[PDB]
Design an enzyme around this catalytic site. Sequence first.
Site, mmCIF file in Angstrom:
data_model
loop_
_atom_site.group_PDB
_atom_site.id
_atom_site.type_symbol
_atom_site.label_atom_id
_atom_site.label_comp_id
_atom_site.label_asym_id
_atom_site.label_seq_id
_atom_site.Cartn_x
_atom_site.Cartn_y
_atom_site.Cartn_z
ATOM 1 C CE1 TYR A 248 -3.508 -2.449 0.354
ATOM 2 C CE2 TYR A 248 -4.296 -1.075 2.162
ATOM 3 C CZ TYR A 248 -4.464 -2.126 1.290
ATOM 4 O OH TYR A 248 -5.597 -2.886 1.348
ATOM 5 C CE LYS B 17 -0.585 -17.464 1.192
ATOM 6 N NZ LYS B 17 -1.048 -18.779 1.671
ATOM 7 C CG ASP C 191 -3.996 -17.775 3.235
ATOM 8 O OD1 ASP C 191 -2.969 -17.159 3.202
ATOM 9 O OD2 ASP C 191 -4.002 -18.968 3.393
ATOM 10 C CG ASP D 34 -7.528 -1.528 4.198
ATOM 11 O OD1 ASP D 34 -8.410 -1.085 4.939
ATOM 12 O OD2 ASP D 34 -7.498 -1.248 3.011
HETATM 13 O O1 AKG Z 1 -9.901 4.907 2.706
HETATM 14 C C1 AKG Z 1 -9.229 4.180 2.002
HETATM 15 O O2 AKG Z 1 -8.486 4.661 1.132
HETATM 16 C C2 AKG Z 1 -9.337 2.684 2.136
HETATM 17 C C3 AKG Z 1 -10.638 2.427 2.924
HETATM 18 C C4 AKG Z 1 -10.483 1.434 3.904
HETATM 19 O O3 AKG Z 1 -11.131 0.550 3.983
HETATM 20 C C5 AKG Z 1 -9.448 1.478 4.987
HETATM 21 O O4 AKG Z 1 -8.657 2.445 4.984
HETATM 22 O O5 AKG Z 1 -9.406 0.539 5.784
HETATM 23 O O1 AKG Z 2 -1.371 -23.621 -0.150
HETATM 24 C C1 AKG Z 2 -0.923 -22.493 -0.111
HETATM 25 O O2 AKG Z 2 0.268 -22.281 -0.386
HETATM 26 C C2 AKG Z 2 -1.792 -21.347 0.335
HETATM 27 C C3 AKG Z 2 -3.007 -21.991 1.036
HETATM 28 C C4 AKG Z 2 -4.218 -21.377 0.683
HETATM 29 O O3 AKG Z 2 -4.938 -20.982 1.414
HETATM 30 C C5 AKG Z 2 -4.700 -21.222 -0.728
HETATM 31 O O4 AKG Z 2 -3.950 -21.638 -1.638
HETATM 32 O O5 AKG Z 2 -5.779 -20.655 -0.911
HETATM 33 CA CA CA Z 3 -10.863 -0.338 5.613
HETATM 34 CA CA CA Z 4 -6.579 -20.586 0.597
#
Ligand code: AKG
Ligand code: AKG
Ligand code: CA
Ligand code: CA
Lengths: 414, 414
Positions: free
Chosen positions: B158, B228, B281, B305
Amino acid sequence: SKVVVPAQGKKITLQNGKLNVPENPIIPYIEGDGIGVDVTPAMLKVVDAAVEKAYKGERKISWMEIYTGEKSTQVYGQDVWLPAETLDLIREYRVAIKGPLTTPVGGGIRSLNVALRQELDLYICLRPVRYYQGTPSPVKHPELTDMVIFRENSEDIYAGIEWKADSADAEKVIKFLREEMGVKKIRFPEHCGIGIKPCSEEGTKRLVRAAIEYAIANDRDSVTLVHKGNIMKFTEGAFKDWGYQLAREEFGGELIDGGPWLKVKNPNTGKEIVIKDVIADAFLQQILLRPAEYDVIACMNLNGDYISDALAAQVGGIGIAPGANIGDECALFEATHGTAPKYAGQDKVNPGSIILSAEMMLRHMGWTEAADLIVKGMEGAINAKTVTYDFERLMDGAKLLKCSEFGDAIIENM
Amino acid sequence: SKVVVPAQGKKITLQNGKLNVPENPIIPYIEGDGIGVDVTPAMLKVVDAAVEKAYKGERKISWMEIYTGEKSTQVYGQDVWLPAETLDLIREYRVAIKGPLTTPVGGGIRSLNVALRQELDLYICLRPVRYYQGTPSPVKHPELTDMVIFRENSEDIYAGIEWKADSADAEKVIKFLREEMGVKKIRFPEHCGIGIKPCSEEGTKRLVRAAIEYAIANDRDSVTLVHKGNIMKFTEGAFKDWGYQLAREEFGGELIDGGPWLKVKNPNTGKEIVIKDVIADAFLQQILLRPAEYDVIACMNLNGDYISDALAAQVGGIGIAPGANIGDECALFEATHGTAPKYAGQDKVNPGSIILSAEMMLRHMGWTEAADLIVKGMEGAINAKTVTYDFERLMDGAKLLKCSEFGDAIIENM
Ligand SMILES: O=C(O)CCC(=O)C(=O)O
Ligand SMILES: O=C(O)CCC(=O)C(=O)O
Ligand SMILES: [Ca+2]
Ligand SMILES: [Ca+2]
């Protein structure tokens, strides 16, 4: 040396798109590691049962075992986790399936699931999430989530074109940005580690192409383009503009009187379809608050992974939700779940992830009549409550039943 | 020119950490755009009421109006969304607050919320999410989520050190990787757009430093390091190793008999505290499935976020959840929500986001006695059901009540 071919089996060919998928097809299948040893034994008995049953002993699958993973060390040896012949037997017998994958640590191999998704060039990850009428739901009103994700696999930050902090090669990249590219905004450049995130044109477009060729071919209703493409405004902002350029040009989309939202000339079926973008994070909370306003989602690798793994467990789906990876050069059906060894070669786990990936497989193969007979065996078991460990560790009323007894019992409802 | 200072107000000073926060302090406050015009009028009447009430007319806040946003075009003019003097009056009157922010499109300014988070160098974004005993919950068992996020603001994707596809400057970067850095793994380099994600050492460490200086100072229980950092294994994998090096070195952490999990010598309070990493995840679905096994989360900008915006609406929290950004050089309390104009200067919206940010403000200021009196007015309104539009568009039983009547009614429960 090793990988045996099944005699009477006929290798699947191609034609003008027409998968010429034979009466006796050879389907390669990697077993996996850990809980693989359990989950995949079932997946065989079971895909044998909906072809013995739908096609009445006519069509019968000829299974080839093949390998990536921990199982090609004590099958090969040293650092040889990523072999030569598995990568080409998918591309030759055109439809293959697989369980979970132990990458090591130390011997440097990098995530063997993303590794096969891009060494074969399989653009689409296909993650449908839905609900079975009563399971393990965190959420009160769970029945609303009937969605399907198309997550781009070639690019994004999960592409990991990455270098380690305090290393040789980041000295060379970081000075390029500071001295040759005029960049500030890195804050503490010392001991910094840098990663590359790419997004390109027929890369975000062959991704949105197939998502929309799927909203039409399956009579689905929205195509929501998910992007945090307001802070990464090229990449995620770019993806959303070119994904709507794919919809602009090759699909003839019309403007909904004012700007941002959009509409399609949808051919073989006629019904009208909406094309939107939500920002990634507003979208994480969308799928909970106003779900059923959301349907075919197309996005890059990261958000793609995170929307599935969120959407999946919100349907109490975690033990069972399916997965597929699609190229033009062939295909791979998969478990979404990992190696799980603390509860492992002992039969505890849900085998349902990868059995739904067999179903999806057969779909693709035009063996609609078989695959559907699998959705019909899953429907019944979760409704008659005869379930594995993971569903009463969140559920009421099952005859205590574990793994190759759930294989048996899918067939009970067929 | 413009920005008036309030006479009797005394500017907040510093000392050896000791915020010397005066009996009459000047607190700068940006109003915002859109729904700001509504939400912030309340936030004034209300912070005036818990100081007139706790400190019994002794302590009284002296509010300075200041600006970023759409409101410095018809206050300045052209492209002048990001002014000079707002950036330094935060850093001089040490605690300021703000509503929502319209960045434009076209005149190239880049996300004015991240823009202020890094031009002041405010490392920590502080996003506590919790529940009020009955509200708008998607989830059945909602009461489990009692967590607080520390999301690093200086770096990550970000940070947007990003260039547009088909542009001049990506020709220069992409050839560097292909020709000078030996990189393949970009898949369709033509018409590709590239973004940089950084992660460094005292950058992931001053982030984990303050999270752990907060688990101890507030007697909190886990510090989960979310990453991650298995596909971006430097950056997110690196963050998790250096965040545990901050915990290794300066905080004296011990191993829980075997590897990965860890434990602290915790000073002023004595109780034992766990330090973990989950993958991003697996963690998105954790907060639903086994919540209450998770507590102080520390991560980079993106996941930061996305875990807040997920965790927030899972508590049915969406209209009300708070936010703060912290440097050593001063601080900013904020609305998590945006400009919302389709339901806008008409009073429809929950003002509760930014009123909880006033509460957090006062906290920090050691005016614990005031801030707490605000948690005590919020508690009562949502329990007596007298609520705004956003809570019965998901709720049963309120005397139809909208925005500067909810301001009034927080005070009703004080
Ligand atoms: O305001 C933003 O630019 C992103 C909005 C948002 O969801 C956040 O900042 O968590
Ligand atoms: O297996 C992975 O490397 C990530 C696991 C996972 O959650 C995915 O692939 O969606
Ligand atoms: Ca947000
Ligand atoms: Ca996954």
